[PDB]
Amino acid sequence: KLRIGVVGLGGIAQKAWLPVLAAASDWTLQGAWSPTRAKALPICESWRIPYADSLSSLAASCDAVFVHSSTASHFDVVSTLLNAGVHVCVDKPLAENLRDAERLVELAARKKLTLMVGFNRRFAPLYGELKTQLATAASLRMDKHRSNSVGPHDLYFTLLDDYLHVVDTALWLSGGKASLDGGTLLTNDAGEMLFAEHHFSAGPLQITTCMHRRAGSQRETVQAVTDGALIDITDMREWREERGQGVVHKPIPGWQSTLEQRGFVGCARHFIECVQNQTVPQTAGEQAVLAQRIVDKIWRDAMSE
Amino acid sequence: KLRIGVVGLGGIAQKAWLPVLAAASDWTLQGAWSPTRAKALPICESWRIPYADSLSSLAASCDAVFVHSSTASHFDVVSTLLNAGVHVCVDKPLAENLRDAERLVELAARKKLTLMVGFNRRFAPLYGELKTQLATAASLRMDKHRSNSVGPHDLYFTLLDDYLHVVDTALWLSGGKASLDGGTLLTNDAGEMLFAEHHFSAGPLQITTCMHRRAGSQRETVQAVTDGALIDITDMREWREERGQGVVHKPIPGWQSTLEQRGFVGCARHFIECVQNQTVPQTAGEQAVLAQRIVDKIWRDAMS
Amino acid sequence: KLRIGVVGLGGIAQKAWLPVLAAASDWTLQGAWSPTRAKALPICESWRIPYADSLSSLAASCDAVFVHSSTASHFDVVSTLLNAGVHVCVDKPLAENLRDAERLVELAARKKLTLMVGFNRRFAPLYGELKTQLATAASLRMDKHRSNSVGPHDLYFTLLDDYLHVVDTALWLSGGKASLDGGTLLTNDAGEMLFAEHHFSAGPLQITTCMHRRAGSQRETVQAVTDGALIDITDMREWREERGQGVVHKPIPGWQSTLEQRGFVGCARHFIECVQNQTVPQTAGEQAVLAQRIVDKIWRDAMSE
Amino acid sequence: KLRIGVVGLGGIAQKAWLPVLAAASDWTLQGAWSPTRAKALPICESWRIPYADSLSSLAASCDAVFVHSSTASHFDVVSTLLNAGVHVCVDKPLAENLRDAERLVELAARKKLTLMVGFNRRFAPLYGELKTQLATAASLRMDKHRSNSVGPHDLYFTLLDDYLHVVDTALWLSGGKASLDGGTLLTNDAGEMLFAEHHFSAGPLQITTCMHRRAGSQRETVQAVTDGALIDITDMREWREERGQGVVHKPIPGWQSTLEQRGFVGCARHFIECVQNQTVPQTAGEQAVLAQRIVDKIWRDAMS
């Protein structure tokens, strides 16, 4: 059975990327570490888990590790772990720099290790169920808004830290083969992201990614207009479809965690399985920098006009 | 009290307009006329409406006429009605061809008559209500679908008879200075429209018009993403907004009159008011062909 | 073709009991009258309809008439019309007195005329569709609340003027054969109705009628718990059912008036048809004073304790 | 930091309680024990929980124990656990028989231990939130159904293992001084419960408990008709209220933890708090058997 390590304080991890390891079957949680040797000691004790004192040890005694620390650190962390011959699964941004990412993708292969990005969304039960229905899709629009989170970081940061999630999911749902027709980027006076919306075209299918940081509501939705059906998904939890017989709400499994709905579980499992079976992850190599390449293409333009 | 006349007793007429033009305290219905004359007499009797065998007969006995018949016969009917000194309220496509539409508009200006297009959606309480909240709007999408209506008519008829609604409403709701950025059109081998979507840009705001003729849902909706709130309107009847403290469902009073929510009532009132007050309607002049100028271009480009 | 007369100013009638005569097919609207010879002259003109100057004339030149005037007048009006050999359809309360009602039911029969109460609810498309589904119903509860209408009239009035509607519909839906097990009646200091809720038992099936005059919302609902399904109906417009495959919203016919949803149309038509076919109306004779007999049974108790 | 022990690793235990008793900063999980011992060892390892071959072994190593096993074995387990100076939090039916339940309560008072019943619904944010708005309530109905669960157990087990939830919650939400007015019970030829409904009266307020084992819906709801507002709560997660200005949907934060919305978390915290603070829990004494005294009577009367 594999030993798994976790890198990632507890801001978010404690909520999902931690109770998700409260499974234990086929693999074990072999300790965890984080840069803030302080706000991590408590959770390690409260959860009864080994607290590595340095990334060196944590890597030493692990076969694979989930990295959920700051996006700025992702590169170094993954870079260190990979060099320790450890399998890694990094959170959304591979590295806050396109090249740096293409390099980790090289290192990982060049060292017969598996490196995949944690696109929990490609593992949400409802998004996967939808993907097997968009065969005759004509319109696909995804929204992810924040009530009031005009993040202290600049546009660049928020693009790789939030919008990337929308682009990733949208492109994965369309079959990964769209073009960037147009869109917009709105920032306040502080150069901070306020809004973002773009349009893609995968043949006849029209894709739309949309995000607003001050919409007075934290909602996430996916709308699909296909031939014979109209499907809508709210918060990866609600599923409504119309097939000419009235609006139908798919039943929500009585005992299902939110960590399973967002695709966290399925992502971990698919990571753990690829290690053993020694297979290529769904989000590795090209699939790990894809959407990032697009997000980058946009920024490269919205910073020249 | 003007004398109101009606043209075209087909479906919508009897379901929407007629019920609006019968219960009137400020005007009176004095006649009707269909290019078919078939079942026309029984229909008119149903409404106690003196049937007119001819337009020039219906015109010679009216002051203002609401036209609603095959988009093709519009020009011939409107120009005639306008030559008889009768104010007219045309139904959606002013005329089948763009130049024709303008011809009628000009003909109305010279003749000094009130010629407006009946864009009922511009008078829907909830839509006009929404138009006042989009000051800080960033995203605006309007969706209008059919469960399975790839009806006999071709792409050209559908663009002018249905997709125009979306394009005109969306542009009206967002200032009215947007530009076409792209989109697509899909038709089966017969040339009948199947799907249509387009993107417009009025500054930072992104507008989207979408219509699918076979999506399994006859739903209509408007989605707005503003600064500090999210508004959704379904079938011109349901209003939901979220401003940081949970979704709210605006109340729906006994005023619940489909004919009123959908804007028919207000459209009629507005037409007659302009006629009696000799003012310019919200759907006249360049405004009665702004969306059509757009829809036409989309079609022409498709055929090239 | 029959000539139909209408008695009923325009408070409500103008909204429904009037645009409902904007049909005309098999019968004609032969004028209308009301006690207030003032606030009725306008509508008669605006709707282009003959304004009888007295109930005498209106009855003289009609074959049947819809009575939608004050409940206090119902008796006299119907009593006059019946004596004029005219067929009548009276609004909800037959007479504000049980005996008086049983007398009109006699007169009407004794004069080979048809007298039915206008229980528009027994003709609402969704309530009728429900009735054919309550075969294995175990629980049936109906609510009818007003946002803030603590009516100037006393408890008695409001019981025959509003609660009667709930009791009628509830009993008709259960098959008309329940018993009054219990309930409550709450009035303010002015002796005005504030609340009302009762429980009936039609064998195993438990029925509940519920009304509050100050619930801060004007909603009407019907809930059914049957064997194999869970059905809910809001405002005679919305229909949701759960049959183990998720919640399903029945589609609302695109072009359907509200006057048709509340059962107004179907009620008029069924009235007009019984005249010609000379058949017994669904709400005539015993079915016209039924629920009223119950409403009365309650009051007779809530006015002795 | 008390030592927490668990009894019964069946379903709910692993889905609700365990996940609540593992992530703890104020206490520690020190063991577990099932009357089956089958797969028990693999389960405990899954949670890194030293398996106890015996109760007196689990007890000898704990301070407080959360019991959740076959309603029948409750008495034998609780009395034993109480004889070993261990505070216990029993699962719904304190004991299978009423006198037994009281026996345990008394045994806890003498022994000076904290004995409470785990009524998670009394600690659900939304339910406790609602209990503060029913000051002017007139009607209160709680509905809990199953799509098709006429499970093996008979009417008696179901009344105590499921219908008790409704009866206890409803009574708790409405003051707690209601009286049984009537209702009905339905069972198939096998004697398995099919449906149950009852009416209570606490003054002018009317309370209704309803449960059907095969209604095609696993829905849970609470309906309140107060003076000036209408509140609806579905599956302890959705809150809707209408106070004259349209229905409102209370917001649902990232706090979205089924285990928390359903009250499990708060129930645990409350138990341990009372133990360490030596105070009386909200579900102890007469309160740990108020609804059971009612449900039993209903059953006895049915069997007469």
Side-chain angles (χ1 to χ4, degrees):
Chain A
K1 57 188 53 195
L2 283 69
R3 291 161 299 157
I4 284 67
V6 181
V7 176
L9 311 79
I12 314 168
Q14 93 91 62
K15 273 289 299 172
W17 272 138
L18 220 55
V20 292
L21 299 317
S25 301
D26 182 292
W27 56 266
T28 167
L29 206 186
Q30 199 58 272
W33 175 82
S34 71
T36 307
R37 72 294 191 60
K39 294 279 162 281
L41 189 58
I43 325 90
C44 269
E45 290 174 36
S46 300
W47 287 60
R48 322 173 287 158
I49 196 62
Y51 162 53
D53 186 29
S54 77
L55 180 62
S56 301
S57 46
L58 195 294
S61 65
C62 279
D63 308 297
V65 176
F66 289 115
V67 188
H68 309 136
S69 63
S70 292
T71 299
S73 63
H74 285 339
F75 185 82
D76 295 312
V77 177
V78 174
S79 179
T80 282
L81 290 177
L82 285 182
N83 290 318
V86 186
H87 296 292
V88 192
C89 182
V90 224
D91 254 1
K92 190 207 299 70
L94 226 187
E96 64 191 0
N97 162 204
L98 205 297
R99 301 64 166 307
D100 272 9
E102 318 198 305
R103 286 170 199 173
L104 288 166
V105 171
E106 290 186 53
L107 178 60
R110 179 175 47 196
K111 290 199 64 194
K112 235 142 288 184
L113 286 173
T114 44
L115 204 274
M116 71 159 250
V117 182
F119 282 129
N120 58 296
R121 294 202 155 65
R122 301 198 192 192
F123 301 84
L126 289 184
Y127 282 168
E129 173 185 336
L130 181 67
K131 200 180 182 301
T132 55
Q133 296 254 57
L134 308 180
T136 44
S139 196
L140 188 292
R141 176 205 176 85
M142 171 168 199
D143 295 68
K144 169 92 187 309
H145 312 303
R146 234 84 198 197
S147 197
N148 194 324
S149 176
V150 66
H153 293 281
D154 64 352
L155 216 207
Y156 186 91
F157 184 73
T158 318
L159 283 185
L160 296 174
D161 205 77
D162 253 291
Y163 203 53
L164 183 67
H165 250 161
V166 184
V167 177
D168 166 66
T169 302
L171 297 192
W172 164 63
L173 279 179
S174 62
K177 55 207 174 194
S179 288
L180 216 195
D181 316 322
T184 181
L185 258 174
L186 180 67
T187 71
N188 59 10
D189 296 85
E192 294 162 352
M193 200 212 244
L194 258 166
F195 175 74
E197 164 159 354
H198 297 85
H199 309 290
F200 305 75
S201 159
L205 167 65
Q206 287 294 157
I207 314 297
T208 313
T209 54
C210 191
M211 175 179 258
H212 197 299
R213 321 290 307 187
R214 230 219 307 291
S217 160
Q218 177 171 41
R219 184 191 303 169
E220 180 181 328
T221 60
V222 177
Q223 294 154 205
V225 172
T226 77
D227 187 347
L230 214 174
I231 305 171
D232 320 292
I233 299 163
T234 302
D235 306 315
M236 285 179 275
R237 182 176 185 280
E238 254 62 50
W239 168 295
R240 301 184 325 132
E241 75 178 9
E242 248 229 273
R243 297 180 178 287
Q245 298 298 316
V247 190
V248 177
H249 295 186
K250 156 183 278 61
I252 309 175
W255 277 109
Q256 180 183 55
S257 66
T258 308
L259 311 80
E260 199 189 359
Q261 291 164 10
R262 325 279 288 194
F264 282 122
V265 183
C267 197
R269 301 263 167 179
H270 179 255
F271 173 59
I272 306 303
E273 276 155 31
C274 299
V275 185
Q276 296 143 169
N277 306 183
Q278 291 163 287
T279 54
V280 218
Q282 221 230 274
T283 65
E286 176 59 24
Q287 277 294 328
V289 301
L290 190 75
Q292 178 163 177
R293 218 182 291 254
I294 294 67
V295 178
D296 196 53
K297 204 168 303 173
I298 300 171
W299 197 75
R300 272 188 285 138
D301 309 329
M303 285 298 215
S304 59
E305 284 98 80
Chain B
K1 272 215 187 184
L2 289 169
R3 286 131 85 220
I4 307 304
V6 181
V7 178
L9 299 61
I12 312 83
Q14 314 169 58
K15 208 79 84 174
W17 297 114
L18 285 173
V20 176
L21 303 170
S25 63
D26 205 284
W27 61 83
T28 61
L29 204 36
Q30 303 288 146
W33 174 88
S34 177
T36 307
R37 213 226 296 190
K39 293 276 61 184
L41 303 303
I43 299 172
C44 297
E45 194 234 9
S46 311
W47 298 85
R48 308 201 296 266
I49 293 184
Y51 183 82
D53 179 73
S54 164
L55 278 175
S56 294
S57 166
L58 171 94
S61 81
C62 287
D63 287 316
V65 180
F66 286 67
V67 177
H68 173 57
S69 65
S70 51
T71 302
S73 70
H74 277 179
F75 181 66
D76 284 6
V77 175
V78 182
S79 58
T80 294
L81 269 296
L82 283 166
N83 292 312
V86 189
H87 304 281
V88 56
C89 200
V90 211
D91 196 294
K92 209 191 315 76
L94 213 178
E96 184 157 303
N97 272 60
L98 225 301
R99 227 199 187 198
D100 291 58
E102 289 158 344
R103 294 188 154 88
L104 292 176
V105 178
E106 274 88 274
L107 173 59
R110 310 195 303 271
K111 240 66 175 178
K112 289 190 294 165
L113 286 168
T114 296
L115 170 68
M116 70 179 239
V117 171
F119 277 128
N120 61 120
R121 285 180 179 68
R122 287 204 193 191
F123 303 91
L126 292 177
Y127 281 173
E129 167 68 276
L130 175 67
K131 182 178 167 57
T132 69
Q133 306 298 81
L134 312 181
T136 77
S139 197
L140 185 66
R141 176 171 179 127
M142 185 192 190
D143 275 63
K144 196 190 182 294
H145 310 302
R146 304 309 301 279
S147 298
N148 197 340
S149 194
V150 185
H153 310 302
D154 63 36
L155 172 65
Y156 188 51
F157 183 75
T158 312
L159 289 177
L160 295 174
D161 181 63
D162 217 351
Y163 193 52
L164 228 192
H165 278 315
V166 192
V167 176
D168 178 85
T169 309
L171 284 166
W172 167 65
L173 276 162
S174 62
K177 58 286 142 67
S179 71
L180 182 50
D181 282 292
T184 40
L185 273 175
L186 303 175
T187 61
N188 49 24
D189 290 313
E192 304 172 307
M193 186 182 109
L194 285 174
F195 169 73
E197 198 186 318
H198 295 280
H199 314 294
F200 303 70
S201 65
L205 178 75
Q206 295 295 305
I207 298 77
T208 303
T209 43
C210 183
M211 176 187 266
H212 195 288
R213 312 293 311 184
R214 186 170 54 214
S217 175
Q218 202 186 314
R219 182 199 310 161
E220 169 168 351
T221 51
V222 179
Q223 306 177 190
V225 181
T226 74
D227 186 310
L230 275 190
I231 308 178
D232 317 285
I233 302 172
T234 304
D235 308 316
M236 293 173 251
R237 189 175 187 295
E238 272 88 55
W239 170 296
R240 297 169 59 221
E241 50 152 322
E242 191 163 3
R243 305 187 131 114
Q245 264 173 161
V247 194
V248 177
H249 287 270
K250 177 168 291 181
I252 297 172
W255 142 104
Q256 211 273 302
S257 317
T258 312
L259 299 200
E260 192 164 355
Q261 315 167 334
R262 294 181 167 287
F264 289 102
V265 185
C267 191
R269 294 230 213 292
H270 191 262
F271 169 57
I272 285 164
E273 255 126 52
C274 298
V275 177
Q276 59 180 48
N277 305 173
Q278 271 163 275
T279 47
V280 203
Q282 236 225 289
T283 57
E286 262 291 344
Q287 206 65 198
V289 68
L290 224 175
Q292 189 176 311
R293 186 188 313 297
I294 292 190
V295 175
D296 182 59
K297 158 83 175 176
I298 286 172
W299 181 81
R300 267 156 35 222
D301 290 338
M303 303 283 121
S304 289
Chain C
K1 57 188 53 195
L2 283 69
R3 291 161 299 157
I4 284 67
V6 181
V7 176
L9 311 79
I12 314 168
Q14 93 91 62
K15 273 289 299 172
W17 272 138
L18 220 55
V20 292
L21 299 317
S25 301
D26 182 292
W27 56 266
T28 167
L29 206 186
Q30 199 58 272
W33 175 82
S34 71
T36 307
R37 72 294 191 60
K39 294 279 162 281
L41 189 58
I43 324 90
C44 269
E45 290 174 36
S46 300
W47 287 60
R48 322 173 287 158
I49 196 62
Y51 162 53
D53 186 29
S54 77
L55 180 62
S56 301
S57 46
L58 195 294
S61 65
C62 279
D63 308 297
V65 176
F66 289 115
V67 188
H68 309 136
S69 63
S70 292
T71 299
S73 63
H74 285 339
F75 185 82
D76 295 312
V77 177
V78 174
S79 179
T80 282
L81 290 177
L82 285 182
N83 290 318
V86 186
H87 296 292
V88 192
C89 182
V90 224
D91 254 1
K92 190 207 299 70
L94 226 187
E96 64 191 0
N97 162 204
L98 205 297
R99 301 64 166 307
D100 272 9
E102 318 198 305
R103 286 170 199 173
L104 288 166
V105 171
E106 290 186 53
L107 178 60
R110 179 175 47 196
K111 290 199 64 194
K112 235 142 288 184
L113 286 173
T114 44
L115 204 274
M116 71 159 250
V117 182
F119 282 129
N120 58 296
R121 294 202 155 65
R122 301 198 192 192
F123 301 84
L126 289 184
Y127 282 168
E129 173 185 336
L130 181 67
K131 200 180 182 301
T132 55
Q133 296 254 57
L134 308 180
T136 44
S139 196
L140 188 292
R141 176 205 176 85
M142 171 168 199
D143 295 68
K144 169 92 187 309
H145 312 303
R146 234 84 198 197
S147 197
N148 194 324
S149 176
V150 66
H153 293 281
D154 64 352
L155 216 207
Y156 186 91
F157 184 73
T158 318
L159 283 185
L160 296 174
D161 205 77
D162 253 291
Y163 203 53
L164 183 67
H165 250 161
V166 184
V167 177
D168 166 66
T169 302
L171 297 192
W172 164 63
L173 279 178
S174 62
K177 55 207 174 194
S179 288
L180 216 195
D181 316 322
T184 181
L185 258 174
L186 180 67
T187 71
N188 59 10
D189 296 85
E192 294 162 352
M193 200 212 244
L194 258 166
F195 175 74
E197 164 159 354
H198 297 85
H199 309 290
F200 305 75
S201 159
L205 167 65
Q206 287 294 157
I207 314 297
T208 313
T209 54
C210 191
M211 175 179 258
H212 197 299
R213 321 290 307 187
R214 230 219 307 291
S217 160
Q218 177 171 41
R219 184 191 303 169
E220 180 181 328
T221 60
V222 177
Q223 294 154 205
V225 172
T226 77
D227 187 347
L230 214 174
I231 305 171
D232 320 292
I233 299 163
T234 302
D235 306 315
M236 285 179 275
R237 182 176 185 280
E238 254 62 50
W239 168 295
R240 301 184 325 132
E241 75 178 9
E242 248 229 273
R243 297 180 178 287
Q245 298 298 316
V247 190
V248 177
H249 295 186
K250 156 183 278 61
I252 309 175
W255 277 109
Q256 180 183 55
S257 66
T258 308
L259 311 80
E260 199 189 359
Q261 291 164 10
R262 325 279 288 194
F264 282 122
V265 183
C267 197
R269 301 263 167 179
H270 179 255
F271 173 59
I272 306 303
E273 276 155 31
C274 299
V275 185
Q276 296 143 169
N277 306 183
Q278 291 163 287
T279 54
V280 218
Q282 221 230 274
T283 65
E286 176 59 24
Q287 277 294 328
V289 301
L290 190 75
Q292 178 163 177
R293 218 182 291 254
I294 294 67
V295 178
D296 196 53
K297 204 168 303 173
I298 300 171
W299 197 75
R300 272 188 285 138
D301 309 329
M303 285 298 215
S304 59
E305 284 98 80
Chain D
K1 272 215 187 184
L2 289 169
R3 286 131 85 220
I4 307 304
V6 181
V7 178
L9 299 61
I12 312 83
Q14 314 169 58
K15 208 79 84 174
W17 297 114
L18 285 173
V20 176
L21 303 170
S25 63
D26 205 284
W27 61 83
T28 61
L29 204 36
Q30 303 288 146
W33 174 88
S34 177
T36 307
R37 213 226 296 190
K39 293 276 61 184
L41 303 303
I43 299 172
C44 297
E45 194 234 9
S46 311
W47 298 85
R48 308 201 296 266
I49 293 184
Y51 183 82
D53 179 73
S54 164
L55 278 175
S56 294
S57 166
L58 171 94
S61 81
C62 287
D63 287 316
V65 180
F66 286 67
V67 177
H68 173 57
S69 65
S70 51
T71 302
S73 70
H74 277 179
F75 181 66
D76 284 6
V77 175
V78 182
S79 58
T80 294
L81 269 296
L82 283 166
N83 292 312
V86 189
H87 304 281
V88 56
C89 200
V90 211
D91 196 294
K92 209 191 315 76
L94 213 178
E96 184 157 303
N97 272 60
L98 225 301
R99 227 199 187 198
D100 291 58
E102 289 158 344
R103 294 188 154 88
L104 292 176
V105 178
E106 274 88 274
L107 173 59
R110 310 195 303 271
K111 240 66 175 178
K112 289 190 294 165
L113 286 168
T114 296
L115 170 68
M116 70 179 239
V117 171
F119 277 128
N120 61 120
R121 285 180 179 68
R122 287 204 193 191
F123 303 91
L126 292 177
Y127 281 173
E129 167 68 276
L130 175 67
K131 182 178 167 57
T132 69
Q133 306 298 81
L134 312 181
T136 77
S139 197
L140 185 66
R141 176 171 179 127
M142 185 192 190
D143 275 63
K144 196 190 182 294
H145 310 302
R146 304 309 301 279
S147 298
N148 197 340
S149 194
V150 185
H153 310 302
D154 63 36
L155 172 65
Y156 188 51
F157 183 75
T158 312
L159 289 177
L160 295 174
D161 181 63
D162 217 351
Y163 193 52
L164 228 192
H165 278 315
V166 192
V167 176
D168 178 85
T169 309
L171 284 166
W172 167 65
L173 276 162
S174 62
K177 58 286 142 67
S179 71
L180 182 50
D181 282 292
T184 40
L185 273 175
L186 303 175
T187 61
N188 49 24
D189 290 313
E192 304 172 307
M193 186 182 109
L194 285 174
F195 169 73
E197 198 186 318
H198 295 280
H199 314 294
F200 303 70
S201 65
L205 178 75
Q206 295 295 305
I207 298 77
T208 303
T209 43
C210 183
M211 176 187 266
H212 195 288
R213 312 294 311 184
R214 186 170 54 214
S217 175
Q218 202 186 314
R219 182 199 310 161
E220 169 168 351
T221 51
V222 179
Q223 306 177 190
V225 181
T226 74
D227 186 310
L230 275 190
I231 308 178
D232 317 285
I233 302 172
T234 304
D235 308 316
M236 293 173 251
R237 189 175 187 295
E238 272 88 55
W239 170 296
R240 297 169 59 221
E241 50 152 322
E242 191 163 3
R243 305 187 131 114
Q245 264 173 161
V247 194
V248 177
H249 287 270
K250 177 168 291 181
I252 297 172
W255 142 104
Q256 211 273 302
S257 317
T258 312
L259 299 200
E260 192 164 355
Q261 315 167 334
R262 294 181 167 287
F264 289 102
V265 185
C267 191
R269 294 230 213 292
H270 191 262
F271 169 57
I272 285 164
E273 255 126 52
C274 298
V275 177
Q276 59 180 48
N277 305 173
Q278 271 163 275
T279 47
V280 203
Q282 236 225 289
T283 57
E286 262 291 344
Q287 206 65 198
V289 68
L290 224 175
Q292 189 176 311
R293 186 188 313 297
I294 292 190
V295 175
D296 182 59
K297 158 83 175 176
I298 286 172
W299 181 81
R300 267 156 35 222
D301 290 338
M303 303 283 121
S304 289

